[PDB]
From a paper:
The first step in genome replication, the binding of the Origin Recognition Complex (ORC) at origins of DNA replication, triggers a series of highly coordinated steps leading to the assembly of pre-replicative complexes (pre-RCs) in a process that involves CDC6 binding to ORC. ORC and CDC6 then function as an ATP-dependent assembler that first recruits a ring-shaped MCM2-7 hexamer with bound Cdt1 to DNA, and then loads a second MCM2-7 hexamer in a head-to-head orientation, whereby this double hexamer is topologically linked to double-stranded DNA (reviewed in [O'Donnell et al., 2013; Siddiqui et al., 2013; Bell and Labib, 2016]). Here, we report the structure of human ORC in a functionally active, ATP-hydrolysis ready state, providing insight into ATP-dependent protein loading as well as DNA and CDC6 binding. The structure of HsORC reveals a remarkable similarity between two very different ATPases: the replication initiator ORC-CDC6 [name] and the replication fork DNA polymerase clamp loader.
The structure of the HsORC motor module was solved by molecular replacement using the DmORC4, DmORC5-AAA+ domain and DmORC1-WHD of the DmORC complex as a search model. The overall architecture of the HsORC motor module resembles a cashew nut. The RecA-fold domain and the lid together constitute the well-known AAA+ domain. We therefore conclude that in the context of the motor module, only the [name]/4 interface is a functional [name]. In contrast, the human ORC is active as an [name] and the RecA-fold and lid domains of HsORC1 form a classic [name] site rotated almost 80° from the position in DmORC.
Numbering used by the authors:
A (entry chain C): 17 to 142, 152 to 239, 244 to 388, 398 to 432
B (entry chain A): 490 to 606, 614 to 661, 674 to 698, 705 to 735, 746 to 861
C (entry chain E): 8 to 81, 95 to 244, 251 to 268
The structure:
């Protein structure tokens, strides 16, 4: 049945809490290790998981946190606080968010404490807590950094069990911390995620498409393993590999080709993935050009001629209008001749599409690459032989 | 519990290995305290030099001396700048620690002026009390100089220039000084080829205790090899690592950057120019054409991890691109193989 | 809906079964008249999936944009912090287990509002873990939305411009009011034969199709085929002016 879809969709789209952990074996040891040390013993630590986006972090910390709380002593004695730089944009918001996640809302609001740290210390004193800060980059950007400084200050000198675990994609993170906070950060505890080898990529491809132990699954997995080796799927997967080296990009590719699978199309084929790959490879700005009116096109060809004449200097509507008038001049009769307000309407539509940028009395520059232009003209459905001849005039 | 008890000894510690600095501060407070007068002392240093720890020590000793009546009594107050959201909450702290308790920053400052027209006031990291008009600094430093005010002020911060915009400085820790602190409590083991290995640093003390604490984590799951591994997991620059693990087209884009730079010789170039180079290389490597939608993705992959400094994506072909890593470093990352 | 049938199969199968999960975010691009929202609203109305639809140029601020999305689910809302809070708190036997859809029209204006708002929406699924799908559609290419720190890259779906044939088939045969649909067809085929090279907007072509229809068939009631000669100069009168 569709039972296939329900599964891969929670794996590909939503991020499956349980899956195969690829190449993180070392990093998981260091994270899970530290986590036992703060939860089971009274130790306080801080660490940063640092990788490109779309690989690693959130699943590692999620898998680590789960296994940690499967210990009965842990689940009862340990509280965890999940923060994110997108949701909490202010250290005051974060303070009240910690108060909320700790079930400490009973403070309650009657005592506004004399200092930020005193309010934070008062919360922990009311017994470990694991602080997860996602999008650590943004927490580094808050005014004077009160939440980071005081979390590390509490992580070191307060002897209150705490675990400050940041997630960031910035190799520049350490330079974003004040000298003081950088010191208090348990120095450069750093997990790096990054990438894998191509054979490992293909093995991942087949592993994510396959189904677990749940005769219907066995037949499915045999067909996946058949896909794993094909001159087509492989030459597509490599093309994605040479760009991605990322399991999230791969998940998208597997998902789009997963729509191709229906009750009338039981399992994926080489073509299902090739089509799914074609949708991702489209050049967005070329697609937009395809739908312009012939007037707008001629304007772009005028702008092209202007960047090739004046040597990449900007331009305004007037000179475009002149060069465009030189195009219709060829014939005494009026074919492409239109009124100036209309031409400017189309011109303003190019700007409305952000295919031209400012810096008429305003100077602007063309955002299209000449190879995009000449390719689009060759692919344009009705393109008249006259505008093509004009295009190559330069 | 053998080398595991060495874990327990790293995170905080006591007592100080700053012997000479301690005596100076003790005599400063003792001098001002014996005379029933006020004063202010500014303490500079690197964040890891033991400034606040030494002060706390001097205070505990002065309280002991105050119990035997060696020195006049008594009261002491401490407040941290980085522990406040809004600098003016300072006036609340000071007053709340004294009598008079709660009040607004305006009413508090007015009250402290009245009281000061003996007590030891520690202001740790007043770098955070900087404000456009700097009234609070002017007040904290003006108060101890009043006749009726008996107040001793200890101001800690990391820079020597702060009072320029009655002084002391803590130098960064040396080879021997750091080596001292580690073995200073290893007494469980009275493993010490490492303590000197880690000891070559600049200049924080926290680095030592946190590094060696990680080394023990390596051992269990201590020799010099364990500490080299510990340091290489920390101070090792991640940039060169990322360039080596970057995808194929990501490297060709860096080569494209280096090509444009070697042509112009500047530190900036536009995505359009870099794009022309990237096309050339993808042509020479047998790769497919670099669709501009793709190349924009790549250039963002490298700008998200801060390998590149890129203008906002709205500017499209007019993005100006700077390297966040020196050209020599990149060439070394691409050419090592 | 016609001539979009291919995009419907992609966007319909992506929806899958309503109790499943779908992409955390989908981004559709195309032109004004591409028919994007006509297809989106139909699919959401017909099935019928619970959803909300909001115009980003109407709501410029957070309060207005976020309060609309919260209210339309069936509520004072300042920052995206409380949306996940009060969206997650919005659950019932209606929304409990099912995919919820939020269509942000003219998302191109999100870029100018709040830095963290577009990223928060792309990942909104795992932020609230409520089985949500945020649907962005705008006339601006996705390449211009990307921020410095990055985001969760959505699925970029392309709604192509209507061809001259796609226009006639959509524009003509679906309102032949008083005559054979073949007569109205030859009418439109002439209408496009003039205005196409200038105005490709389906919206405006429908106007002119309605405007100049009476004069086109006036020789019929007055007793006088091949009426292309009749209206073409009249059509060209409106072309270079309108
Ligand atoms: N080593 C790995 N093991 C398991 N899953 C992985 C691995 N690398 C990448 N993935 C997949 O890629 C996705 C990455 O998600 P995650 O949020 O954990 O990291 P991230 O996307 O870098 O986080 P961020 O939101 O900061 O970008 C997940 O869906 C996961 O399934
Ligand atoms: N000589 C020492 N012996 C033991 N521990 C030390 C020593 N010097 C520094 N430390 C470490 O430094 C901490 C004391 O803080 P320190 O006096 O460096 O604060 P600070 O210098 O005021 O902070 P910052 O300079 O970042 O504002 C202790 O927790 C201890 O781990
Ligand atoms: N296949 C079709 N059949 C009939 N009418 C259509 C069709 N496609 C588009 N239209 C016209 O377009 C309108 C639908 O608007 P559309 O879907 O183009 O909005 P949109 O593309 O989301 O708008 P924008 O792109 O400006 O945000 C309909 O009301 C109708 O006038
Ligand atoms: K669904
Ligand atoms: Mg994440
Ligand atoms: Mg200090």
């Amino acid at each position: 049945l569709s039972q296939v879809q329900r599964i891969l969709r929670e794996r590909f789209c939503r991020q499956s809490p349980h899956s195969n952990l690829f190449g993180v074996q070392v990093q998981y040891k260091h994270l899970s290790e530290l986590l036992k040390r703060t939860a089971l013993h009274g130790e306080s630590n801080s660490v940063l998981i640092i990788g490109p986006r779309g690989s690693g972090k959130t699943m590692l910390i999620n898998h680590a946190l789960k296994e940690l709380m499967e210990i009965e002593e842990v689940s009862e004695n340990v509280l965890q606080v999940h923060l994110n730089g997108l949701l909490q944009i202010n250290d005051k918001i974060a303070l009240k968010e910690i108060t909320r996640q700790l079930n400490l809302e009973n403070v309650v609001g009657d005592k506004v404490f004399g200092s930020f740290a005193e309010n934070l210390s008062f919360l922990l004193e009311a017994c470990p807590v694991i602080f997860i800060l996602d999008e650590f980059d943004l927490f580094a950007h808050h005014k004077n950094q009160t939440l980071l400084y005081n979390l590390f200050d509490i992580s070191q000198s307060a002897q209150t069990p705490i675990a400050v675990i940041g997630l960031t994609c910035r190799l520049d993170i350490l330079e974003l911390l004040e000298k003081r906070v950088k010191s208090r950060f348990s120095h450069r505890q750093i997990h790096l995620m990054n990438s894998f080898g191509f054979p490992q990529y293909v093995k991942i491809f087949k592993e994510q498409l396959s189904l677990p132990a749940e005769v219907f699954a066995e037949k499915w997995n045999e067909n996946v393993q058949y896909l794993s080796e094909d001159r087509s799927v492989q030459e597509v997967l490599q093309k994605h590999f040479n760009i991605s080296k990322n399991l999230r990009s791969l998940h998208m590719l597997l998902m789009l080709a997963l729509n191709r699978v229906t009750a009338s199309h039981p399992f994926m084929t080489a073509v299902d993935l090739m089509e799914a790959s074609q949708l991702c490879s489209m050049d967005s700005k070329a697609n937009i050009v395809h739908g312009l009116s012939v007037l707008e096109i001629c304007l772009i060809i005028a702008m092209k001629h202007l960047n090739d004449i004046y040597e990449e200097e900007p331009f305004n509507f007037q000179m475009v209008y002149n060069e465009f008038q030189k195009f219709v001049q060829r014939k005494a009769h009026s074919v492409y001749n239109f009124e100036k307000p209309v031409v400017m309407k189309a011109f303003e539509h190019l700007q409305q599409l952000e295919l031209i940028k400012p810096m008429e009395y305003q100077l602007m520059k063309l955002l299209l690459d000449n190879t995009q232009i000449m390719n689009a003209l060759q692919k344009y459905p009705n393109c008249p032989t006259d505008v093509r001849q004009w295009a190559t005039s330069s | 519990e053998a080398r595991l008890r060495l874990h327990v000894s790293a995170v905080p510690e006591s007592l100080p290995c700053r012997e000479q600095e301690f005596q100076d501060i003790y005599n400063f407070v003792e001098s001002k305290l014996l005379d029933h007068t006020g004063g202010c002392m500014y303490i500079s240093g690197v964040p890891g030099t033991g400034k606040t720890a030494t002060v706390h020590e001097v205070i505990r000793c002065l309280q002991q001396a105050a119990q035997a009546n060696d020195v006049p009594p008594f009261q002491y107050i401490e407040v941290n700048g980085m522990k406040l959201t809004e600098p003016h909450q300072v006036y609340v702290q000071i007053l709340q620690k004294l009598t008079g308790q709660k009040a607004t920053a305006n009413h508090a400052a007015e009250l402290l002026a009245k009281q000061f027209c003996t007590t030891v006031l520690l202001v740790d990291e007043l770098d955070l009390l900087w404000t456009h008009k700097q009234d609070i600094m002017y007040n904290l430093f003006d108060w101890p100089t009043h006749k009726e005010a008996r107040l001793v002020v200890l101001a800690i911060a990391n820079t020597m220039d702060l009072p320029e915009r009655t002084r002391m400085c803590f130098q960064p820790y040396t080879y021997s000084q750091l080596q001292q602190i580690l073995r200073s409590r290893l007494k469980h083991l009275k493993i010490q080829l490492v303590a000197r290995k880690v000891a070559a640093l600049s200049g924080d003390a926290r680095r030592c205790l946190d590094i060696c604490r990680r080394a023990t984590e390596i051992c269990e799951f201590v020799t010099i090899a364990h500490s080299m591994e510990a340091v290489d997991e920390m101070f090792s620059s991640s940039y060169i690592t990322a360039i080596k693990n970057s995808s194929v087209l990501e490297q060709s884009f860096l080569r494209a950057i280096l090509a444009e730079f070697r042509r112009s010789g500047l530190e900036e170039a536009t995505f359009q120019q870099i794009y022309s180079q990237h096309v050339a290389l993808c042509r020479m490597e047998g790769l497919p054409y670099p669709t501009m939608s793709e190349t924009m993705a790549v250039c963002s992959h490298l700008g998200s991890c801060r390998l590149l400094l890129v203008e906002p994506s709205r500017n499209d072909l007019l993005l100006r691109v700077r390297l966040n890593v020196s050209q020599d470093d990149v060439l070394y990352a691409l050419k090592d193989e | 809906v016609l001539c979009r049938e291919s995009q419907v199969s992609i966007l319909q199968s992506l929806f899958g079964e309503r109790h499943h999960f779908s992409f955390p975010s989908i981004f559709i691009y195309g032109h004004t008249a591409s028919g994007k929202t006509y297809v989106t609203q139909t699919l959401l109305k017909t099935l019928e999936l619970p959803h909300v639809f909001v115009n980003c140029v109407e709501c410029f601020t957070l309060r207005l944009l976020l309060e609309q999305i919260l209210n339309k689910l069936n509520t004072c809302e300042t920052f995206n912090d409380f949306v996940r809070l009060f969206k997650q708190v919005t659950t019932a036997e209606n929304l409990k287990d099912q995919t919820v859809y939020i269509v942000l029209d003219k998302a191109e204006y999100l870029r100018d509002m709040e830095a963290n708002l577009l990223p928060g929406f792309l990942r909104l699924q795992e932020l609230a873990d409520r089985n949500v799908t945020v649907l962005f559609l705008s006339e601006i290419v996705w390449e211009k939305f990307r921020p410095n720190t990055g985001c969760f890259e959505p699925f970029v779906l392309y709604f192509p411009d209507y061809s001259i044939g796609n226009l006639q088939k959509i524009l003509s045969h679906d309102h032949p009011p008083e005559y054979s649909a073949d007569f109205y067809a030859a009418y439109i085929n002439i209408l496009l034969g003039v205005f196409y090279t200038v105005c490709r907007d389906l919206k405006e072509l429908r106007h002119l199709a309605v405007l100049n229809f009476p004069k086109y068939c006036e020789p019929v009631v007055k007793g006088e085929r091949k009426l292309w000669r009749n209206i073409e100069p009249h059509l060209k009168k409106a072309m270079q002016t309108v």
